[PDB]
Amino acid sequence: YFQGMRCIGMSNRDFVEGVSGGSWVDIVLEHGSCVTTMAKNKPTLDFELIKTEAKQPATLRKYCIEAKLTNTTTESRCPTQGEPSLNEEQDKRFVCKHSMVDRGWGNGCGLFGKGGIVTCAMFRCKKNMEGKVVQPENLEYTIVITPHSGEEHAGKHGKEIKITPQSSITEAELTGYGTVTMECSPRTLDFEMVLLQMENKAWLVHRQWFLDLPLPWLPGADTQGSNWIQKETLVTFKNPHAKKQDVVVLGSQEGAMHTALTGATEIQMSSGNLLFTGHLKCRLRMDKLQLKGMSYSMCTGKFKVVKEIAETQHGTIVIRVQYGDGSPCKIPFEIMDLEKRHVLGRLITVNPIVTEKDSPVNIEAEPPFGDSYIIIGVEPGQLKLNWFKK
Amino acid sequence: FHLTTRNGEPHMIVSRQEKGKSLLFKTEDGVNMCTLMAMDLGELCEDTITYKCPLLRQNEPEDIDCWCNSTSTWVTYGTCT
Numbered sequence: 001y002f003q004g005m006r007c008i009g010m011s012n013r014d015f016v017e018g019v020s021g022g023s024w025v026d027i028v029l030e031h032g033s034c035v036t037t038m039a040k041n042k043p044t045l046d047f048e049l050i051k052t053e054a055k056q057p058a059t060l061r062k063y064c065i066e067a068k069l070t071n072t073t074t075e076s077r078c079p080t081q082g083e084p085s086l087n088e089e090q091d092k093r094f095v096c097k098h099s100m101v102d103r104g105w106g107n108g109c110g111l112f113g114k115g116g117i118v119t120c121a122m123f124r125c126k127k128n129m130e131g132k133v134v135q136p137e138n139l140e141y142t143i144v145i146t147p148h149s150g151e152e153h154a155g156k157h158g159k160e161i162k163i164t165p166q167s168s169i170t171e172a173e174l175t176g177y178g179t180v181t182m183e184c185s186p187r188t189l190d191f192e193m194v195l196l197q198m199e200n201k202a203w204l205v206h207r208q209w210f211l212d213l214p215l216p217w218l219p220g221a222d223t224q225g226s227n228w229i230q231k232e233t234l235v236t237f238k239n240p241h242a243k244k245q246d247v248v249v250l251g252s253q254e255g256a257m258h259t260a261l262t263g264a265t266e267i268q269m270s271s272g273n274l275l276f277t278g279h280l281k282c283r284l285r286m287d288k289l290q291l292k293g294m295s296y297s298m299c300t301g302k303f304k305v306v307k308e309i310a311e312t313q314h315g316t317i318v319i320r321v322q323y324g325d326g327s328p329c330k331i332p333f334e335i336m337d338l339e340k341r342h343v344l345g346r347l348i349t350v351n352p353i354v355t356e357k358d359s360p361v362n363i364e365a366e367p368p369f370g371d372s373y374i375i376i377g378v379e380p381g382q383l384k385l386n387w388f389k390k
Numbered sequence: 391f392h393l394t395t396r397n398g399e400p401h402m403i404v405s406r407q408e409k410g411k412s413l414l415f416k417t418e419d420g421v422n423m424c425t426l427m428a429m430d431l432g433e434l435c436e437d438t439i440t441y442k443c444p445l446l447r448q449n450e451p452e453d454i455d456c457w458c459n460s461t462s463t464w465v466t467y468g469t470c471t
């Protein structure tokens with residue numbers, strides 16, 4: 001319900017900070033994890049790599065896995081008169097075979113002996129699969145950059161940006177804070193492999209295995225879908241007869257394929273695109289970021305802790321509070337010792353502010369170890385909340 | 391059946407209702423009588439097969455289910471049912 005909560009709820013969360021000013025800060029992005037960055041007088045940001053997909057990868061080969069036969073035609077000659085022929089034997093949509101069959105007086109020949117026979121049938125593919133080649137480049141990573149403000153929702157999305165190992169340094173705008181500049185590298189994912197697609201379900205398979213599959217196929221850059229290569233793989237020519245020969249096609253191979261792929265890493269996908277779990281290394285600069293809300297008034301009023309203070313998985317706490325006497329204002333937050341003499345701990349939410357009257361403003365802070373006073377607000381009722389961090 | 395041609399030669403498109411009956415069609419060289427014995431002769435559809443019925447003069451047929459006695463003819467029929 002609040003901005004920056006997603007990362008707080010994650011178990012895998014890194015805290016990074018720049019040891020310089022205007023310098024680059026390195027971070028490592030992984031699926032299922034997030035990174036929180038902080039810097040003096042800069043807002044705290046959350047980074048997450050949510051998607052890694054290949055867009056329109058080169059199609060290597062289309063394999064037919066189910067076909068039908070039509071217009072089967074037979075031609076044969078008597079012993080002594082050479083090899084017969086059919087013009088459709090020149091039509092790339094047909095599968096044909098040449099053979100020899102006994103001939104004689106019983107079937108129109110002068111001599112008894114072997115004769116040449118030929119049979120062709122139009123081959124029509126009804127269901128095919130295609131294997132694609134994914135290039136490391138042209139891979140597209142989606143990264144969400146969310147401002148760690150604590151603001152609420154239940155319209156405040158983090159900026160989403162898509163990049164490629166070939167795209168240049170990105171300048172992402174964060175409404176209200178400026179822009180953040182970052183560059184990434186697909187720093188170590190392999191692709192002599194191939195990705196097999198059997199009707200919206202894909203697998204990652206080794207090459208030379210895909211290329212060896214005994215099934216009719218077509219070079220990747222095709223669109224006719226008619227001139228199949230090695231159709232005999234799905235066709236069987238029965239023993240011929242003097243003037244006719246039967247030709248039957250094997251049944252679908254979708255099944256033989258499925259129960260043949262068991263074992264190979266299955267690959268998710270959607271909208272025709274393949275998805276992977278990528279790994280990125282990036283560097284970002286915050287010199288163009290600034291705090292949203294500087295130059296306001298220091299709330300002079302009251303807050304009622306909306307509910308039970310929460311402990312995160314990262315040695316930090318999330319305090320919900322809602323104004324009270326004042327403008328949409330800055331909040332006076334400060335974690336001190338039991339004596340209220342020195343400042344201890346620090347805020348992860350920075351320049352925490354109230355946008356509305358009765359608008360739960362979540363605040364994530366890091367209390368020191370042991371005892372400390374969480375002082376929220378000012379002099380009518382400065383809110384002293386005791387806290388013990390174990 | 392529909393009588394057409396295939397490279398100058400007569401071609402017979404045989405339908406299901408002709409199974410078991412003598413096929414006769416006039417030709418310059420007199421009347422031609424082809425005999426169709428195809429067991430798999432069915433309904434005319436996409437699954438056709440097409441082949442030749444040889445001329446057979448005073449010779450018993452062997453390893454064939456179609457033949458004519460005056461002029462070699464091509465034949466085509468479906469196998470559907």
Ligand SMILES: *[C@H]1O[C@H](CO)[C@@H](O[C@H]2O[C@H](CO)[C@@H](O[C@@H]3O[C@H](CO)[C@@H](O)[C@H](O[C@H]4OC(CO)[C@@H](O)[C@H](O)[C@@H]4O)[C@@H]3O)[C@H](O)[C@H]2NC(C)=O)[C@H](O)[C@H]1NC(C)=O
Pocket residue numbers: 070071122392393394395435436437438
């Ligand atoms: C493989 O077999 C398929 C059948 O499953 C074929 O299809 C089409 O093939 C021919 C044309 O290529 C069609 O036949 C003709 O039909 C028209 C109209 O119905 C007639 O006007 C034609 O006429 C004839 O012309 C005459 C005078 O004008 C007549 O005296 C003469 O004897 C001719 O018969 C002719 O009948 C056929 O209907 C159609 N097939 C079907 C049934 O869907 C494929 O064409 C065939 N070829 C391949 C390998 O693809």
Ligand SMILES: CC(=O)N[C@@H]1[C@@H](O)[C@H](O)[C@@H](CO)O[C@@H]1O
Pocket residue numbers: 420421422423459460
């Ligand atoms: C060459 C020859 O034998 N011609 C006859 C033909 O006249 C006759 O119509 C048919 C059956 O009646 O038998 C033969 O085809």
Ligand SMILES: CC(=O)N[C@@H]1[C@@H](O)[C@H](O)[C@@H](CO)O[C@H]1O
Pocket residue numbers: 419420421422
């Ligand atoms: C020579 C020729 O083809 N004419 C007749 C033919 O019309 C007839 O159908 C057949 C017997 O019925 O005898 C043939 O001689």
